[PDB]
Amino acid sequence: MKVITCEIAWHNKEPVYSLDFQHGTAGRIHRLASAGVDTNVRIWKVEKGPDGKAIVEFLSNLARHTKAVNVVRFSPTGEILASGGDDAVILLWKVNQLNKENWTVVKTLRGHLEDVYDICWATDGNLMASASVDNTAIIWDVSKGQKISIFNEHKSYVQGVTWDPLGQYVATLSCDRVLRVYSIQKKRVAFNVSKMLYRMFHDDSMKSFFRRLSFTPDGSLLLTPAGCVESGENVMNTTYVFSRKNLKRPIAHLPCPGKATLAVRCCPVYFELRPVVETGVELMSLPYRLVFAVASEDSVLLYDTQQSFPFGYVSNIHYHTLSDISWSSDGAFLAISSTDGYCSFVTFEKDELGIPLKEKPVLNM
Amino acid sequence: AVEERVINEEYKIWKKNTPFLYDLVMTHALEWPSLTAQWLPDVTRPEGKDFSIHRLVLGTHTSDEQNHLVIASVQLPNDDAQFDASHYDSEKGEFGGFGSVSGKIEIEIKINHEGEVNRARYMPQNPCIIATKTPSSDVLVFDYTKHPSKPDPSGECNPDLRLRGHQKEGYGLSWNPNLSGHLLSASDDHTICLWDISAVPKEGKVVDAKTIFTGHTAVVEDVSWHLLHESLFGSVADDQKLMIWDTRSNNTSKPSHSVDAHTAEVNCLSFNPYSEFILATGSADKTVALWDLRNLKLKLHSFESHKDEIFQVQWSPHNETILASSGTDRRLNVWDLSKIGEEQSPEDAEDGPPELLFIHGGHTAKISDFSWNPNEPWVICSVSEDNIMQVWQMAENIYND
Amino acid sequence: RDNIQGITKPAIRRLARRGGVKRISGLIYEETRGVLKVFLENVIRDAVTYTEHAKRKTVTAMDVVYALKRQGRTLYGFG
Amino acid sequence: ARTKQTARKSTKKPHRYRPGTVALREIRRYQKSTELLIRKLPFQRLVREIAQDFKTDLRFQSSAVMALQEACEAYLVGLFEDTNLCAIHAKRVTIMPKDIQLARRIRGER
């Protein structure tokens, strides 16, 4: 891969807290949407340059947040942006000075009492899941925009949410060193993954705002960062991987000695099963392989599914801690945010990670 | 007081004009006038900072107070910061801004010195040993690395090596760049002294004259060791003559190459840091003369733009063709040789000879001494007799074109 | 107790020294003390409310970084 | 010789970075300043009085107090830089209180 640290003033050189990409457009020009302390959600055009360099072309400047913007999450269709600020306000920008396009806040959501940290969209795109400092992980409907559930069963801030693509689970992970999984219909904490057989996840003392975790788009792996394993001296910063067969106990984990892991974002496009070399542990045996990235505080670890060890590693690109990562719709990009003010882009060649499947397998919802 | 009035008016005009001509001017007012100035080769460029720190060696001419050899530290913005998108001006229309990003001159180390410091030249091999010339016959040798930053409150001075051998005071002193420790001094007693400091025992404090010279018939004004050779050094005196000396010769009063230099009394000389055959000698006839060591019979040229005496002629450590002359005219002409014998229009020739490249009119009083910055290009620290120390540099459009 | 004047005058002098200025009126030290007290008030109030919304008692550096982010500033090397 | 005379004893408002063409890679600001310039006792007593004014049993940690100190030194050097800019814009080098309020109101926190 090619690492292109975009030495550009994203948000007044102020910290950038989350990134995302447009998954509804199949072109080679990708629409990113950053967010940071500048109380602005800047949307950019991202495309490969003449030499393959990932250059960023400004698209629009979005300004309706009174406080810092933490998490930005495009809808699965890509036509309904989200924006989780520090004012417990979730703007839903939908299209239609220096702006090349206009974005208008369609709807304002008022359900939280403190800063919103993580936002996730359901597979159908008609729902929502926001994790906020208020010790509540809310579930919102875009059509009506009201709090339908409040899982106020935590003890500290909730910093990471996700929606299971099959549509059955909603994994919320707090700063209480606990993992919670909520059914879509039951709306109960069925899986209180906190102990393994000592507590696994990091306490509230680690230097990272977010603990973002995401299900694999296939929907069978639950990848949760900020885990500690009592295998080294006293702690090993890892990233537990959970399987639907038994979510109480992870199938494995992906230790990241050095900086603790805080984000996981899987590449949405699947890949063909690479030929077996009889040298991998096969995290999950599936007809298709998929690539994700586990961004620690100051490093990125692009894993796979047929290979035990990561197939990549990107570190020291950003002086301060990383905040969020995002994969492009085609899978040729990996935009890594950072708290120092700039975002680096990891770019791949065409059909470089693998051979994407001609027909995307369906998921039993 | 009409002379002071016209001098101040010309200085005000020059200050108004200085954005056009100069590129870095740092006028500083010393506590006491300095009779010498010399940059030190060590330049500090701390990481994460946009300013580089140099060091000077300035004496102090005091009427009654104790004279301290000053080692000042200047601060100049880095070349990386020399072109930054800082701001813009609506009315001025230049991306400038005064602000507070500015240089600073701070005195670092002062050493008590008996009498005035006539000339303070640091040893190039060890840029910590410093030799100064006193109004007395002796020559002091200091070392600021072995002395406290704060001067001793008592008036007594403790030179590291007091060098004797003369009978008067002479502003001409020069270290030997190639031979470690050798020292030369041009006293007004019509005598030149060569001292071998590298042979001094660790417990020695006073060292006599290893070699004496008598060939000159008047007060020796200045001497300088050859920059490339080992046992060759010039000597210009009030006898309107220049004699090139050689220490390897047994005879000490034999002027190996004795040639009359100027109608008036020669005042200074400096050898080219690149060419091994070229030395430029000042004069009291306002005529800097170029010489070739191959043939001393006829001068290469007779640079004539001064109106008064010329005190210090220094070459350039960055260009082999760039001179600099100064004197009682308060005008530091920066000559060059690339324009030797160039045809010019009368309108552009009324200013002066084509060899002249820049005139520094920003000194209200006589220029005492000056020295080019060896690290930075064209930066010159010229100290005047009116307690002014300017660190100037002409703009890039006068030499690069 | 009432140690408003704890921040010494040369502390303000050095703060201005790397603050760019080299020319300060003499009656600005009271203004700087008041400014610092107000900033402490705001930052500590936000940090304490973050701690209270975390079911904890002792304020740590992460709460302070949260408070500074809420104000609009950023702290490097701590969170 | 040279005659020598007597020696005279002597002694615009929005700084919003444009979203593009800013290749800044500073590293000095991304690390600890290591220049506290405040003794621990006065700052400690100040934080203690603020905390006891706010809520009892609101204990702090040395890490938290050091974070306070670093943030406040950064805030005050930023304030003094802004007062410098305001005073220069006002054709006057000396700061005044009115310059402090002007910088505070320019930063948007007033």
Binding site: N234, P250, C256, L283, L302, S308, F309, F311, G312, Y313, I317, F348 | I13, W14, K16, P19, F20, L21, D23, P41, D42, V43, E47, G48, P77, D79, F83, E94, F95, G96, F98, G99, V101, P127, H229, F277, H318, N319, E320, I340, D351, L356, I359, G361, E376, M394, A395 | P10, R14, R23, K57, T60 | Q31, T34, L41, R48, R59, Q61, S62, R92
Partner: protein, 213 residues
């Protein structure tokens, strides 16, 4: 500390001998000025509109003016103001009336912080904190006493020791001052390929997956 080179030309062993030979011949055949125009003179190096069209920024600092030190690009072009004659007058380009006098008619008691004061002055003192614990281990002990969450005491002690060690390590790293972090990019290695470099393969196998039963 960067030292300017003592010699700006290559050391020629025969240079001294050639100079000694030429010093005695005293032949006027060689002319230096003639050869200057036929060759490049020897030089040595140092030891909104676009920037390239503006030039590099000028510093003009003066001691006698109350106005601060101008530090910025100057682009006005005036043919009358030539370097060979600085005191030329160019009206309608720069009005030759004083500007610094307008800048600062100060007449104020401004604490004179320019130099020699504000830095040398200092003080010292001592204090003890017992009732109020502003300490990392003392703070941890106080928060453990306030709330425990049924945690293990030896685990808490080990965590406190590890936190103290991490704080000490961070303080030590702060002593390194600026430290440029060179980006580390590792290619898309695969277990299928056999021609990959062993360095990358090992530095990635160090991040293997520890499977749990």
């Amino acid at each position: 500390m960067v030292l300017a080179p003592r010699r700006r030309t290559a050391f020629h062993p025969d240079l001294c001998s050639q100079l000694d030979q030429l010093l005695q011949q005293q032949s006027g055949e060689f002319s230096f000025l003639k050869d200057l125009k036929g060759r490049q003179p020897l030089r040595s190096g140092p030891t909104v509109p676009e920037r390239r069209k503006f030039g590099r920024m000028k510093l003009l600092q003066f001691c006698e003016n109350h106005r601060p030190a101008y530090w910025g690009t100057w682009n006005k072009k005036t043919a009358l103001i030539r370097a060979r004659d600085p005191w030329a007058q160019d009206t309608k380009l720069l009005d030759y009336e004083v500007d610094s006098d307008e800048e600062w008619e100060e007449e104020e008691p401004g604490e004179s912080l320019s130099h020699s004061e504000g830095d040398d002055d200092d003080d010292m003192g001592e204090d003890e904190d017992e009732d109020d614990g502003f300490f990392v281990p003392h703070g941890y002990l106080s928060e453990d006493e306030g709330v425990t969450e049924e945690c293990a005491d030896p685990e808490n002690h080990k965590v406190r020791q590890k936190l103290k060690a991490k704080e000490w390590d961070e303080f030590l790293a702060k002593g390194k001052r600026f430290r440029v972090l060179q980006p580390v990019k590792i290619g898309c290695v695969w277990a299928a390929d056999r021609d990959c470099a062993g360095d990358d393969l090992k530095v990635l196998q160090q991040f293997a997956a520890c499977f749990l039963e």
